[PDB]
Amino acid sequence: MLKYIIPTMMLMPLTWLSKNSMIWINTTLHSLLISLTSLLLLNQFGDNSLNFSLTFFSDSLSTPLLILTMWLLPLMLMASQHHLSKENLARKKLFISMLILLQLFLIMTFTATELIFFYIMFEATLVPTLIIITRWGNQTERLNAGLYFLFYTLAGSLPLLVALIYIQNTMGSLNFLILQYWVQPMPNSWSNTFMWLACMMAFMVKMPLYGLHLWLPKAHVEAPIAGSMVLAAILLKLGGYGMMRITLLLNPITDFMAYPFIMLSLWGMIMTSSICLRQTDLKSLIAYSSVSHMALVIVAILIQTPWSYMGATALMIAHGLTSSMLFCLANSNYERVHSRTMILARGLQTLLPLMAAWWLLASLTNLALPPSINLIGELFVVMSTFSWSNITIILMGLNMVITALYSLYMLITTQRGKHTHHINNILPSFTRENALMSLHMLPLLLLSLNPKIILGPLY
Amino acid sequence: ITKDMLPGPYPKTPEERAAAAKKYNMRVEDYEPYPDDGMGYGDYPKLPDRSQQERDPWYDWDHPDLRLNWGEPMHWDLDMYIRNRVDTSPTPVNWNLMCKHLFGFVAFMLFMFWVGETYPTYQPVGPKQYPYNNLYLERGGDPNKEPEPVVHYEI
Amino acid sequence: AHIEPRYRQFPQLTRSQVIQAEFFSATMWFWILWRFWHDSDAVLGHFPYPDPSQWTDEELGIPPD
Amino acid sequence: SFPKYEPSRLASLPTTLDPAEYDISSETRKAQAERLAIRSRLKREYQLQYNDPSRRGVVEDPALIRWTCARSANVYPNFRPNTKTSLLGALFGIGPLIFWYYVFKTDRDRKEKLIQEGKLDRTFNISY
Amino acid sequence: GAHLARRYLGDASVEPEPLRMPTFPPDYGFPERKEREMVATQQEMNDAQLVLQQRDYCAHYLIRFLKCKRDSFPNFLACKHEQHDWDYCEHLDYVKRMKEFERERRLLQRKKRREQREADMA
Amino acid sequence: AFLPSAAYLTHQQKVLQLYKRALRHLESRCVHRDKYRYFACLLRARFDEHKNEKDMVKATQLLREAEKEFWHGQHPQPYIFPESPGGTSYERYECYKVPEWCLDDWHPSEKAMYPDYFAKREQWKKLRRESWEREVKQLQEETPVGGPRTEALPPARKQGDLPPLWWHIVTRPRERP
Amino acid sequence: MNLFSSLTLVTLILLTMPIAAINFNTHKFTNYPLYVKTTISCAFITSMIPTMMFIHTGQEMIISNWHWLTIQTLKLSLSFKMDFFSMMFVPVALFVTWSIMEFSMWYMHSDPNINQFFKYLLLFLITMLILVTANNLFQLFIGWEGVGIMSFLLIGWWYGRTDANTAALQAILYNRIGDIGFILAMAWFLINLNTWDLQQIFMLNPNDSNLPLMGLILAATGKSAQFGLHPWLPSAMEGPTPVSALLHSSTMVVAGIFLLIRFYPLTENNKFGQSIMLCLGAMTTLFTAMCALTQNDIKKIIAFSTSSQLGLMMVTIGINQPHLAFLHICTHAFFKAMLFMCSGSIIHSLNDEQDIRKMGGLFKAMPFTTTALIIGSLALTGMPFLTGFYSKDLIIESANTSYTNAWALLMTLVATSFTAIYSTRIIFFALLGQPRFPTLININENNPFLINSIKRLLIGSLFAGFIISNNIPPMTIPQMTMPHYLKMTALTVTILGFILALEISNTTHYLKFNYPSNTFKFSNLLGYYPTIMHRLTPYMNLTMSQKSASSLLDLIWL
Ligand SMILES: CCCCCCCCCCCCCCCCCC(=O)OC[C@H](COP(=O)([O-])OC[C@H](O)COP(=O)([O-])OC[C@H](COC(=O)CCCCCCCCCCCCCCCCC)OC(=O)CCCCCCCCCCCCCCCCC)OC(=O)CCCCCCCCCCCCCCCCC
Ligand SMILES: CCCCCCCCCCCCCCCCCC(=O)OC[C@H](COP(=O)([O-])OCC[N+](C)(C)C)OC(=O)CCCCCCCCCCCCCCCCC
Ligand SMILES: CCCCCCCCCCCCCCCCCC(=O)OC[C@H](COP(=O)(O)OCCN)OC(=O)CCCCCCCCCCCCCCCCC
Ligand SMILES: *C(=O)CCCCCCCCCCCCC
């Protein structure tokens, strides 16, 4: 994995020694070269994972999240370069350095052989994201979110730390490869119940869980575009990756500890999708859509069937691409009308036809139009949860109505109807913006041809 | 925008009510808030819940599709009462009379299909008769076992 | 030359559209009368429907006891 | 005589059949004139900015900004936990969760009992 | 259609129910009753790929008609008489079903008048 | 009720609007033209029976139960004109009504495709920008204290000036682009 | 063999080639609608050869040509099922679409987005022939959602209009409620039968198949506008006329009926599914035909016509006669597409006038349109030996002579009378009588595009029932023995409907003004069903989506 970490670190002398008009071009070029390099991780096997060293490994779960992570950096550099034009050059290089450092943390978070190195890199990803959100977020009003981050630290990552140190003392190792063969059944006891909550609640907030999703339509709103792209595309999926690693140790107690949280997600995707029908803020609507889609990944991990893991990792990759494109479309209107109000600028297909085509395609991938991998992930999760319980199809299908309903409403409000009269700064689409939409959508459409590379280790 | 045009807490004194009605750009007599039960509406005006479909269409609107003006204090559920959504418009038939006619019609048709399923109509014939032991090997019978003889006779 | 718009009076007609409309109306009634002359049973009936009461007890096997 | 129209929540009374529309009193003249005055003043304040050539951008509507700030920001700092808020946050907050919990637990206990008694037709069920 | 009124408005005791009948033996009233001959062989209608609803006691006319329909392509109006033969023998099969129904109705009339004669006599 | 110029409906306007809506809903009830024309003169007679009513309170009550008559006898789906609101072709071409300022955002290679049009559009915009400050200083001295009472605007008074708030009414899109 | 599968795939690739043409464009087109119409004409000619060599031998096959995915026991391959249903539906759909596009080159000539319109209409055709040729549930779900989304995009064609967007989102809502049941069926077959392929479903032949058939009946309810999920098909007349002609009369709306005809070996061994299909179809064909009696927009009346015919299709599936239902689909396409084309020819001639109360006097003004509208109405009602006689009457000849729900049969006959009632209502208010349109006559139809486009579907509406029903093989046994009052049922009920509606129409010339009855207010406001549920079910959602979901729980308590 050291053929990826070292070029990502060499992006730091590349971004600090570059000429002042060249720092976007150079970082975009070399991060696209790293993303082309990232396809060497597709050397996967039907029995063995790709095990590089004592520190790094890659099965077919971590590999597509790595490719999506290394692909997300050039797109963030394209998306965030317009609204940093009047920024200081040194502050602009600090922004690019925090993006590069976040990629550096993520690409060795997903490959972490041992679980406390996963914990260190997992909680290391929060700091450059925090600095990007609070130094370039264009407004900061976080009176209620401070107490929620305190709740995240109390109920989340610290019990995970104590639990992983406990497994280190009990099993003697936290290597996931060793824990594949030295796993003991975790029986019914109160010690094992608090053990399960400690191993799971950090990743429950990171997904997020319904009821615990209070941070996500704030942190998505108060962020720049690169921060919202990396939150929607990668930083939610650390929770799902960590659940799919840590549920190896949590058998068979998961088979009766999943029942509350499954309810919290199965009803929760009914609520948040419905919440998207009453959103004034477009970026908040995409945030609650992200909650409504990660609820299915929570259910699919907690029911731990093969079809559910295949659908959950396909849904993670697909929703990463789709929701990142949705935030980029929301920014491509916000950079013109200077307000996130979804009822402000209407009828935009009269003014921007190709951009409305991109809105249509991102909406159709948002509502899981087949054969897109949004639908493949959605569908396999629905099949596995039907095998879990035959009634849940109702709570699936009703969600699959409301998921359609706000997806086209977001299309109908922003793009259709009568244009707003008093807005006359609606410029034509820059080639940068259309390139950003295409570099989201065309990989998402090409993955419908060959979905087997995004269906996880047990395809 | 600045603070003294933003919403605040519930108006208790009448001068705070007057300051809000000047802030929300409407008459003080029309300005009523949502009742302070603690549901978090604040000092927002309780508009009388009229859908935007009901408005004057021929009026020169600032927002013609919304049927809404500039500076007008909008309804709280303005995203809900757009003409793509929930309407409250008057109908030619009464609301309860519509609900009664629909429920009586649907339940009576359900009951009549239950009556017709209770008493089915048919033809004055016997059952359809098939050769070769009611087509035993055709309908998936095993070749080693032999069923009872299903023999039909001329008439 | 096209059909000129007219005002409060009967519009201009082409000979071709009138003879085509009369031709397809004649085609409809020709095909109806033709298949009614040759089939005459898809509308009226293919075979005689027998009377059940007009059947004797010997062919149906009713011994009077 | 005639069937009187019944108003509803989703069927409002018409403007023609409302009696207070037929008020002729001078205080209704004052109220209607003040509403026309506020509406005309706001219309003028709008379309002086709207028809301005030197402005190229968005005529910002503080009623719309105020509406979005009410729908987003003003929700927590004007909350008071009382009987009504706690009972309504306990009805629709932990009600249907408990409902679907007992429904799905009942069906899964039934299915598990049928599987461990050899009853459920799990013949061609090898995808799961 | 009058028998629907006879079974619903009248009594269902004398009217033969559609679902399970004959309730009488086939030899009851018939001295030396013969079976129904099948003309087309089981393997012959197996190779002709006939529908399981269509493999009744007169499927051999259907086999001749479908062979004519295959052999007369494209002249799709050249085999009207083979269709007429198949439709006429299906009509006769329906007539035999009507005869079974009238047999069952008249034997239920025999049972009804038998028990009424027994109640009058004894 | 809700009007741009008046704050209310006069009783004369209410009578005329109820007569018009009654005839329209009647024509919806009474499809054929001679039949509607017969019932239309009958209804005109019914409206002219109490045309000469001096008592405005009695005329108010008569108008009120006339509204009840019209509501009791209304058609459920009255004939709406196609480009009237509620019609089948209503606001159909609003997706084709591009605002004029978008011509400012064209590329010069396609602005040069229509040279006379944009060469005239330059002096249209010139006319607008040298008319704007004159019509603003026209409106600021005629508007009473407290803002304007009614939404109606004064016309161009001097010769050479243009009427105030005129650019979006003149340069509005065509109804069939 | 090598001819059949080759031309089968050549038809679909040929339909996809103008999509690559419109996507790889730099110039302004040398009549791209003519290019798409020429392509679909040649695709019709191409698909004629596999149909003829199916009528020769009965040659069916499967083309599982491209392996796509293997989820551990489920090999999802790109698999095309060429059976009787594809071999009869593909030439009918291509012929109807070819006439609709030669219609659209006249009707949609003023639209500057004409290339986008023909692109979207070709995308619909591609997704629909993906639907009707799919061999597994996944490719069928691809075509299913494809015709749903192209329905959205072609209802909301005038996207500035609020009502078009509203009707398009309404249609998406009801179709996704049907998709709940479709995904229920896919879930049941994957768990209990380990397949989405039709062949393993049919070969395993499950017995406890009530739940997947309830899922399929809910899918056909969402798709074919059955009762409960019906009003989007009358709402969907807000799109253009060739949209409502091709998609929402003849091609898309038969796909729920086609989904239930496709699964006939499961329905023929489940009497409960047959009874539910019979009851739902009789309810829909009663209700929509009753609503059609008192409407005044001609597109609404012909949409209620096609939804009542879909309810009759559901009825004749529910008597376990699926092949008669599919013959009725192939029959119904011709005259119902032609009726929408003639209605839209009246609409475009009378300057966007759609309300029948401002029409009339068009017997001699538009002679060819009047001729074809009368022929389409008589094919709809069941005139003897038009195309609609060769299926629909047989439907009644199997609805009487079967073990049937009696009230479903009686409502089927009431629907059969109502078809004649609204057909002669259209001919009365639109063709007969004296004019009612405004004074500036711009009435014209003398374009060879319009005349030939109505002419080829006119040849279809005259001869196609005879040709198809003498070219299709027997798959059931036709019940041909019945009493004379039972053989003459459908014709007599249709003529009674004509007589009753002629008396109704001749009561309108009288100089009397009656107060509206409760039956008129019920049927004119659409059984009160789009008036209540379109207000109540959004309300109870959206307040619950704001008060308790957003504000109470997910901003304050949690
Ligand atoms: C590895 C090699 C592979 C080669 C094959 C390619 C595989 C797929 C690649 C991507 C396909 C989409 C590309 C175009 C869309 C994005 C750009 C766009 O909008 O352009 C508009 C523009 C045309 O419009 P315009 O009028 O010029 O301007 C825009 C208008 O102003 C305003 O626009 P508008 O409203 O007028 O029109 C927009 C219209 C709007 O139409 C719709 O929204 C309708 C779409 C939904 C319904 C119909 C489809 C339903 C599903 C069935 C079909 C799929 C399965 C088929 C298989 C058999 C059955 C199972 O969209 C289209 O027409 C797009 C056609 C393709 C749609 C694909 C499905 C999108 C729906 C969402 C996902 C669905 C599931 C996933 C599908 C995955 C397919 C592989 O297109 C172009 O200019 C083309 C640009 C170049 C495209 C290159 C494509 C390849 C890129 C990959 C590069 C790497 C590999 C090398 C291959 C190179 C090949 C040349
Ligand atoms: C003008 C364009 C045409 C090209 C002109 C220039 C070339 C001249 C023509 C000759 C072409 C070359 C020879 C033939 C092609 C190669 C044949 C071959 O074996 O190829 C290997 C394979 C055949 O499959 P396979 O079975 O060998 O291998 C599958 C791969 N594994 C086993 C790993 C899973 O691929 C192809 O043939 C690719 C073409 C497929 C065509 C259809 C694509 C549809 C895409 C839809 C995406 C979504 C699907 C969703 C639905 C799925 C089902 C429900
Ligand atoms: C064979 C079995 C048959 C079984 C039958 C019984 C089950 C089904 C019961 C019926 C369900 C559907 C009917 C209720 C919802 C209909 C919503 C709808 O269509 O709204 C349309 C409405 C606009 O309609 P309209 O008034 O005509 O507009 C033109 C002029 N304004 O548009 C709007 O107002 C916009 C509203 C947008 C937001 C919609 C919110 C409501 C969402 C409803 C989801 C329903 C999910 C059901 C799941 C069932 C699972 C089993
Ligand atoms: C007994 O009546 C057998 C016929 C089938 C059941 C009754 C059907 C009655 C309606 C059809 C005939 C209508 C004739 C005008």
Side-chain angles (χ1 to χ4, degrees), chain F residues 24-36 38-39 42 46 69 71-96 176-177, chain G residues 107 110-113 157-163 238 294-297 351-358 428-429 433 435-436 505 507-516 520-521 524-526:
Chain F
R24 290 297 177 185
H25 284 264
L26 184 65
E27 187 176 1
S28 298
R29 299 294 298 162
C30 295
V31 182
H32 291 281
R33 297 296 297 165
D34 54 355
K35 182 253 187 68
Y36 170 65
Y38 182 70
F39 283 102
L42 294 175
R46 290 180 62 189
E69 179 72 33
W71 185 257
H72 180 75
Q74 64 180 354
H75 197 276
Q77 294 184 359
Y79 177 73
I80 304 170
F81 291 96
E83 288 81 7
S84 175
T88 65
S89 178
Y90 174 65
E91 66 186 1
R92 177 176 292 175
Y93 294 100
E94 294 293 327
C95 63
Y96 301 108
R176 299 292 178 92
Chain G
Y107 183 81
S110 297
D111 194 359
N113 298 115
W157 178 251
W158 294 286
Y159 60 91
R161 175 171 171 80
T162 305
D163 294 331
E238 193 63 36
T294 60
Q295 295 296 317
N296 301 114
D297 191 80
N351 295 321
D352 288 330
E353 181 64 31
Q354 300 182 355
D355 192 75
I356 66 176
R357 295 174 289 181
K358 298 295 190 291
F428 181 75
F429 288 92
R436 291 183 295 274
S505 296
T507 53
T508 57
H509 293 282
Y510 294 153
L511 294 176
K512 284 91 175 67
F513 177 75
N514 295 115
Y515 289 161
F520 184 79
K521 290 183 179 181
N524 199 359
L525 292 174
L526 305 182

Side-chain angles (χ1 to χ4, degrees), chain D residues 26-75:
Chain D
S26 297
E27 63 268 13
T28 60
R29 303 293 187 186
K30 289 175 94 288
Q32 285 172 351
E34 186 175 359
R35 285 195 290 270
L36 175 61
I38 295 171
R39 189 174 68 201
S40 301
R41 182 182 62 85
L42 291 176
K43 182 69 71 176
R44 184 68 58 84
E45 185 180 3
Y46 170 66
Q47 65 185 355
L48 285 175
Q49 293 179 355
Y50 171 63
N51 295 317
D52 189 4
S54 66
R55 182 197 59 81
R56 184 175 183 270
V58 175
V59 175
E60 63 184 3
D61 195 356
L64 181 58
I65 298 170
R66 195 174 300 118
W67 178 63
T68 59
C69 185
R71 292 288 296 274
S72 68
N74 204 2
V75 181

Side-chain angles (χ1 to χ4, degrees), chain G residues 302-477:
Chain G
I302 307 169
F304 281 112
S305 175
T306 190
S307 63
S308 179
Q309 295 295 318
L310 290 166
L312 184 61
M313 291 172 187
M314 186 67 75
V315 165
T316 178
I317 299 168
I319 62 171
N320 198 1
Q321 296 292 321
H323 292 86
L324 296 173
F326 182 67
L327 179 59
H328 187 72
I329 293 172
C330 294
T331 289
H332 180 267
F334 290 99
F335 57 87
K336 192 56 65 73
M338 184 175 70
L339 282 176
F340 270 107
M341 286 166 68
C342 294
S343 67
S345 182
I346 293 168
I347 290 159
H348 185 78
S349 296
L350 294 178
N351 295 321
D352 288 330
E353 181 64 31
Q354 300 182 355
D355 192 75
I356 66 176
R357 295 174 289 181
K358 298 295 190 291
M359 296 180 186
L362 296 174
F363 181 78
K364 294 181 180 179
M366 293 175 73
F368 186 79
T369 302
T370 303
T371 297
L373 197 150
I374 291 166
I375 294 173
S377 294
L378 290 174
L380 179 67
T381 59
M383 184 70 205
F385 299 101
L386 295 182
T387 183
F389 178 73
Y390 290 106
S391 64
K392 180 178 185 292
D393 187 73
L394 286 178
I395 291 171
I396 306 300
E397 293 184 357
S398 180
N400 292 319
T401 61
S402 65
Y403 185 76
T404 310
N405 189 353
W407 182 255
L409 178 62
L410 203 150
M411 293 294 102
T412 300
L413 296 178
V414 172
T416 302
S417 67
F418 285 177
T419 53
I421 292 175
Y422 59 71
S423 296
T424 187
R425 181 180 175 87
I426 291 298
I427 302 169
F428 181 75
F429 288 92
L431 298 172
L432 296 175
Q434 295 299 110
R436 291 183 295 274
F437 56 88
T439 63
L440 186 63
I441 294 99
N442 208 169
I443 291 170
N444 193 1
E445 67 181 3
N446 288 316
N447 194 11
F449 289 160
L450 177 65
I451 300 301
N452 285 312
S453 67
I454 299 175
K455 180 181 288 186
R456 293 167 303 184
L457 287 180
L458 186 59
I459 294 169
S461 298
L462 291 174
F463 297 99
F466 183 77
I467 290 169
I468 291 169
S469 67
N470 290 318
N471 286 318
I472 59 171
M475 298 301 290
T476 65
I477 296 168

Side-chain angles (χ1 to χ4, degrees), chain A residues 277 394 398 401-402 405, chain B residues 53 83-87, chain G residues 163 166 169-170 173-174 177 180 217-218 221 227-229 235 276 280 529-530 533-534 537-538 541-542:
Chain A
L277 290 176
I394 298 167
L398 194 147
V401 172
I402 303 171
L405 287 178
Chain B
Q53 180 68 40
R83 297 188 292 116
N84 294 112
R85 281 184 176 180
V86 181
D87 194 2
Chain G
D163 294 331
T166 304
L169 190 63
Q170 172 179 355
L173 190 150
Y174 287 107
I177 293 174
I180 302 173
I217 288 163
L218 181 58
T221 309
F227 183 74
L229 301 178
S235 298
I276 296 301
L280 181 65
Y529 187 79
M533 296 298 287
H534 294 168
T537 312
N541 209 167
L542 293 175

Side-chain angles (χ1 to χ4, degrees), chain A residues 349 352-358 360-362 364-365 368-373 438 441-446 448-449, chain G residues 19 22-25 66 78 80 115-116 119-120 123-124 126-127 130 138-139 142-143 145-147 149-150 153:
Chain A
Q349 188 176 0
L352 272 67
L354 181 63
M355 190 62 73
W358 294 116
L360 176 60
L361 295 179
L364 294 180
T365 59
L369 184 63
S372 66
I373 51 167
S438 56
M441 179 52 69
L442 295 175
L444 181 64
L445 293 176
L446 286 170
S448 302
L449 294 171
Chain G
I19 302 296
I22 193 75
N23 287 316
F24 293 156
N25 54 359
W66 182 56
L78 184 63
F80 296 99
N115 291 323
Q116 183 181 2
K119 178 179 89 273
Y120 285 171
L123 289 170
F124 169 73
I126 292 169
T127 56
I130 286 163
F138 185 78
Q139 184 175 0
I142 290 167
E145 297 288 331
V147 301
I149 293 305
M150 300 318 293
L153 292 173

Side-chain angles (χ1 to χ4, degrees), chain C:
Chain C
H2 62 87
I3 299 300
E4 180 69 27
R6 292 181 179 177
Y7 182 72
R8 290 184 194 259
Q9 64 185 356
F10 186 74
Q12 187 181 4
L13 295 180
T14 311
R15 190 267 308 273
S16 179
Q17 60 176 353
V18 176
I19 63 99
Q20 286 298 107
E22 292 289 331
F23 181 76
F24 288 115
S25 296
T27 302
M28 174 178 70
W29 288 106
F30 175 74
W31 184 253
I32 288 171
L33 291 172
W34 183 252
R35 293 292 96 195
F36 183 74
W37 183 257
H38 289 284
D39 292 331
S40 297
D41 293 332
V43 183
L44 293 172
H46 298 284
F47 296 108
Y49 185 76
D51 195 2
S53 65
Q54 294 299 108
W55 290 346
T56 60
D57 287 331
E58 189 268 330
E59 64 179 359
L60 296 175
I62 309 299
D65 289 329

